[PDB]
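Inputs:
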Amino acid sequence: MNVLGSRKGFTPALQHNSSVVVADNSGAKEAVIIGIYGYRGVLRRVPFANIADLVMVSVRKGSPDVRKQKFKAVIVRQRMPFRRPDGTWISFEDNAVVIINPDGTPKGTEVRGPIAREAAERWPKIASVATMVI
Amino acid sequence: RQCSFCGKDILPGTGLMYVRNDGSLLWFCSSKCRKSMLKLHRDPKKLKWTKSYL
Amino acid sequence: RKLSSPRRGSAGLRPRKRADEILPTPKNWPLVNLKEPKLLGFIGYKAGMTHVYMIDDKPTSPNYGKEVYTPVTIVESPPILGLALRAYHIDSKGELSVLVDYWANFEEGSLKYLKRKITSLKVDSSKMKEKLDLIQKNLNNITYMRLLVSTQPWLVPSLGKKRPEIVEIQIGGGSIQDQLNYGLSLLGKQIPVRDVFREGQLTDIIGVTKGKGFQGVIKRYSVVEFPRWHKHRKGSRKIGARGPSISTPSYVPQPGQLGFHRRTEYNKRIIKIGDNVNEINPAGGIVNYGLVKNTYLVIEGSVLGSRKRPLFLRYPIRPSWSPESAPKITYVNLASQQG
RNA sequence: UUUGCUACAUCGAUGUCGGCUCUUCCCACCCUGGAGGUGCAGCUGCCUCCAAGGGUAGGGCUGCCCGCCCGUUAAAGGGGAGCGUGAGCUGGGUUUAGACCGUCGCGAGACAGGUCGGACUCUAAGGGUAGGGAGUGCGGACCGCUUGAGGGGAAGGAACCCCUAGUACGAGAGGAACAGGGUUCCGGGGCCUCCAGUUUACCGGUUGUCCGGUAGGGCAAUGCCGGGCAGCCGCGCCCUGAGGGGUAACCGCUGAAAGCAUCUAAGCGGGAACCCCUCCCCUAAAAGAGGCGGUCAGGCGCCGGGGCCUUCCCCUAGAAGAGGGGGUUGAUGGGGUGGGGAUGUAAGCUCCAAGGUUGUAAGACCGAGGAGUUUAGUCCGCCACUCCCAAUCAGGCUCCCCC
RNA sequence: CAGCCUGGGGCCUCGUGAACGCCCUGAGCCGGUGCACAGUCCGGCAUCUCCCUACACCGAGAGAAGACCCCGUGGAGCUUCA
RNA sequence: GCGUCUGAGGGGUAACCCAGGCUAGGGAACUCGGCAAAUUAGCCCCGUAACUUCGGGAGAAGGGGUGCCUAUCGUGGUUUAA
RNA sequence: AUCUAGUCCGGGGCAGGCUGAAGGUGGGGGAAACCCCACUGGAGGGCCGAAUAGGGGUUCUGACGUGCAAUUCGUUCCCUUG
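Outputs:
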């Protein structure tokens, strides 16, 4: 939303039908990557996603009122080894996303676990309720 | 900057940050160290090629 | 139903064959660009590579004024020993053949290194006088002026060889009369890379890539493994069809040699020209190469070709940006390439 | 492009749907470029024309095609090439033999109505293709370096963002573009610095086993497992402008025809992912078959030697060939010494040891294991120094044209 | 969305040692003509020879008087209210 | 008992084929179809649904322990043997 | 009718385990009707499982497909006291 003109993107992480946890207080707990915004691909190359990407998933485990529903989020946690511009390598023990409202602000009001610095700039609303940033 | 496991000197531009939910930091000289915790759980003390031997 | 697909493999470089001289040569030269007599390239060797720490010099860099990490290749730069001057002119039929050569090592150069590979001139008729003034007589009707130089690998134990290569470089500068005199001086002596280059320049690379042997189509042109079932059925590592008909069994991926090619490289900016071997030598002797003991060229990115290949360098043909000198550094990795 | 008829060709076979991979073409342009009109404030529109250089996805249902739909994207164009492609493939549809079901039949059974299974052959004579090699001519033998006719290209293409600018514009809601930067994606060419993987080089633990016990070993599709060098690739990293010329459509100007007018008729200027030149790649089998440097001696056909090749030792390289080196005037490979690495601390010795065996006691004896003896020991297709050993003996081919 | 390694083949070398396609050896490609898709014909474009390996694109490649449709006052079989 | 399921030697071993091993991250997006391949697996104990033809289903499901050594103990057999 | 189909006669085989019907016995709950538990008991066209114990040939449409052979080989299945 605000920083993607910089080095928005890193080594390949995820794919369609990839399952991630919901790290907030929204009510959703488990979600599967259903689609990728923006990206355009080529023959047989599965579409991509990593940290700080407008991503589209659906609710698999969570409150019934959100079960089997469509919502937007951003990617905050990945297991991939990758190289930061200052040449450090960051990883997250699992893969998590935070659901965002269609305007851009997160739907949830709480944040679970650390987030790589990159998401905060691309989504300052996330940084608004962000607790710790790595 | 010291390895979480072998603790030895980390010559710059390598290693990997495996950040947990707690925000703790894990530093590995190579793959040997990373396996030493994330999957081996073996004792750093139990061996004698890390300074934490005794 | 016949979905879109870019033609796979690279049709641009057909034919793909192996070079006939280990040390290639440029076929064009970037313009002189309004300056004085000096050379436009250099020779060297591929010693190894590492990663380096610098402040960004690109004024428009997104990383400007910060320390970022970047792989960097080392190029030992042994001194160059010139041989002769070659005359090119619009001859009969309006072509640019060699008018004449101008050799001189009888006045200086009691070196049998050249003798190892060429049974070169004797003192009996070292009468280049009538040759040299021929240039003077043919002055003002000359177009290009290259230079005969040789490498001196015997000053580098890393490459266990003693018969050297003699190769060419075209010189641009001010007036033609100046250039010949400029070259005339350079004969019979030794020339450092600093005599041609300075830090912060761009440089071009033509050389021979890492050979690989006869290859497979899977590897040669990155053709695709057939899906699933062929990993079990009738064969997997081949293209299915080979053309609509004998109407040109065409430029299609077919096996053959890959590597050892004459190739190209653009937009390479140097980092450091140091002279202390201890500043760059890694731990335990650089891998597969030895211990650099002459002046070296600190070039980032990747450089084509296998270790222990001569490399011939060149000014930028289509430089992307005009660089300033000295992208200062902050760290050099002396750690073992092993481990 | 289908679909209707035609039976001219194929019945001693042109093997039939789809799909997969892979190549190319075409333009009736989906997007990207150029120009314009508009019931075009701007964005979004709608439409015409030129333009085939490039791109034109990923999924669900259906075997397909078709069709319906999901979420992005610039859109997710349509057709050909024996409905491109089985001596490249899948057999899902469909063309047999077994059965069931529905309609009809007294019956053999028929159905174009549905459903389960049902064999997919070939060592490339010749060409094409992709590489790699010998020779003749170009011209006596050579060694070396170069000129650079044509050949191919997409060697780049695309999007998003920063600021322009919350500006222009519109009352407002809303909301531009030029240049300039940058990023990403896809594609193209490289490379292993680091990371990931790889590691039947190596090291350890450890089951079962036997070789008398330890040790050291055989084996058990590396016995299993843990680790990881180099090398190689990737999920890693690096490079991947623009301009000059001629043009399309068209936009102009000077201008008569035809006094005026008229962009056009001659005349003149601009004007595109359009064609070419600059870029890279292979080129003296280019027949005009190039040029330049040097040597081929010396002496009396002869002596002689000079060049080259093989042989020799290796690897920058690889199917051999080739290519690159070295060859006593030497660091090319082994040895040795150091250097830097991988495993993870050799044996034996000592001490301790859950308890027990003794032994009057004292003491000594067994014991899976822990510690020191010890960043050990083993190993390292890596580096340097060191002439200790090895590059010799030998064979072949050939020049004396020039004085 | 591909990658590395191992055994046997495949590479090479000694020995043994076949069969298939053969009017031919004269077959490069492109338009054209013609049984309406050529190796010879027509018009161009090129095109030095020899050798080895990989590819099966073509040779309307080879394998088999097509398993389908129909004809023959041709068979066989089955059935019945012939 | 065999080195006779009877041809062998060279090599840094190209591609490729057949047998395999292993692959980060995602985990059916491939695909007509999860085909293949993988995962589990011996044993003891605990614990075990709906339904039903009451017999099973039923190794339903699921959970826990399993080595090596220093000791022991219990049970039973056996030797002319309550 | 040395193959196969069938039958008859006379012969030769199915390593090891598991499961546990009937019945028997003893506890225990209540005078009863009889019920629960423990063991014993060893019935069944029952179950797992020995490449070549023996049988069939299931998927890999897996290799060969001018063979190991004019019907196989390796994988990979189901049966095994009737």
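Remarks. The CA atoms of residues 6 and 37 of chain B lie 11 Å apart. The first strand of chain B starts at residue 17 and ends at 19.
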